[PDB]
Amino acid sequence: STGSATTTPIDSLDDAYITPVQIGTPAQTLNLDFDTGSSDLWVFSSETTASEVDGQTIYTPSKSTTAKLLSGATWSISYGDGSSSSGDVYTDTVSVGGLTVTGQAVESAKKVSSSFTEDSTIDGLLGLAFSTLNTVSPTQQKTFFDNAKASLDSPVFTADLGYHAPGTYNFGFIDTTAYTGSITYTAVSTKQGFWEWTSTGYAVGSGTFKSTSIDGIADTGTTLLYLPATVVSAYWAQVSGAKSSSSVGGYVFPCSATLPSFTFGVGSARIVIPGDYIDFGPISTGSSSCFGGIQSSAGIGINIFGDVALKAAFVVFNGATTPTLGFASK
Numbered sequence: 001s002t003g004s005a006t007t008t009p010i011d012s013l014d015d016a017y018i019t020p021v022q023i024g025t026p027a028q029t030l031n032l033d034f035d036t037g038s039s040d041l042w043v044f045s046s047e048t049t050a051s052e053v054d055g056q057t058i059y060t061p062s063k064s065t066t067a068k069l070l071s072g073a074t075w076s077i078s079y080g081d082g083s084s085s086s087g088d089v090y091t092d093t094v095s096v097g098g099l100t101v102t103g104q105a106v107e108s109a110k111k112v113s114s115s116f117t118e119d120s121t122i123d124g125l126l127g128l129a130f131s132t133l134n135t136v137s138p139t140q141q142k143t144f145f146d147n148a149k150a151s152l153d154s155p156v157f158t159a160d161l162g163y164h165a166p167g168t169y170n171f172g173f174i175d176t177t178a179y180t181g182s183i184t185y186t187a188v189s190t191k192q193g194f195w196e197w198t199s200t201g202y203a204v205g206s207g208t209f210k211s212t213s214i215d216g217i218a219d220t221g222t223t224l225l226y227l228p229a230t231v232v233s234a235y236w237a238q239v240s241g242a243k244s245s246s247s248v249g250g251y252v253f254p255c256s257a258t259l260p261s262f263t264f265g266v267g268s269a270r271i272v273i274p275g276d277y278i279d280f281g282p283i284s285t286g287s288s289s290c291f292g293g294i295q296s297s298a299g300i301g302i303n304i305f306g307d308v309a310l311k312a313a314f315v316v317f318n319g320a321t322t323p324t325l326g327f328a329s330k
């Protein structure tokens with residue numbers, strides 16, 4: 001089997017991407033944030049504290065003939081940005097782009113933090129990291145990909161995110177028309193539960209590539225590219241007027257600037273992030289200072305290849321017995 005679904009930016013900055021997901025019988029379609037940096041599929045629901053729902057589409061398990069309460073099970077998660085949610089657990093039929101999993105754990109939110117309430121476009125998350133990070137207690141549950149894997153034509157999914165445009169998540173096959181050149185594959189460590197890999201270095205603009213190992217995670221659920229302070233300082237030093245602002249919370253630059261590209265290494269291959277991808281617009285409405293899309297990972301504890309990096313590539317998440325990541329230009 002295979003599946004293919006379009007993913008769509010939630011706003012004009014590509015802050016996140018939403019993908020329609022069918023849950024239950026008859027189908028209830030919710031728009032979920034596919035997150036390769038977590039492993040819970042959770043949704044706004046009929047059980048979510050009413051005051052914490054503001055415009056989201058909710059899952060109503062009592063209207064699904066295939067919903068089943070997982071007795072006594074609970075879940076609770078917090079994310080890198082400090083947001084969080086928690087609740088109880090159902091299993092139900094879940095389809096993504098024509099690909100169906102029966103008995104998928106669908107984690108129903110009782111509580112969500114303010115950032116989720118305030119984002120009316122995101123109805124939940126669908127985690128695609130390794131199932132070892134799943135937060136269901138007392139018994140951890142499998143991700144949609146893990147459940148689907150044995151049925152897939154190939155044990156893979158791909159992320160093809162757009163720049164200010166829709167893109168695609170495919171399950172079970174690699175669309176050889178969706179990228180240019182070849183896909184370069186690179187080793188993955190699953191020891192921390194993430195799609196963790198080592199980039200072979202970077203370049204700023206037209207500068208010479210610096211060979212240096214950069215461990216990080218491929219994370220579709222993170223907006224920006226977070227890299228060591230050394231790397232990030234070298235990038236912004238090439239932008240006139242750029243500076244790190246503690247009050248804003250990162251590097252800012254004059255909105256009138258022409259940003260250089262940023263290249264990261266995948267083995268002997270190179271992915272070039274155009275300068276425009278690194279502009280995240282005015283720091284506040286009407287400001288002539290703009291927020292940068294490459295920021296320091298110092299304090300996070302890990303480097304994160306978020307959407308700014310991933311949208312420059314066609315990315316293969318290979319869930320074979322020994323997982324790997326593939327990157328191609330497009």
Ligand SMILES: NNC(=O)Cc1ccc(F)cc1
Nearest residue numbers: 035037038079080219221302
């Ligand atoms: N969905 N991604 C996140 O919540 C960001 C993140 C991941 C791992 C980590 F160790 C720190 C932050």
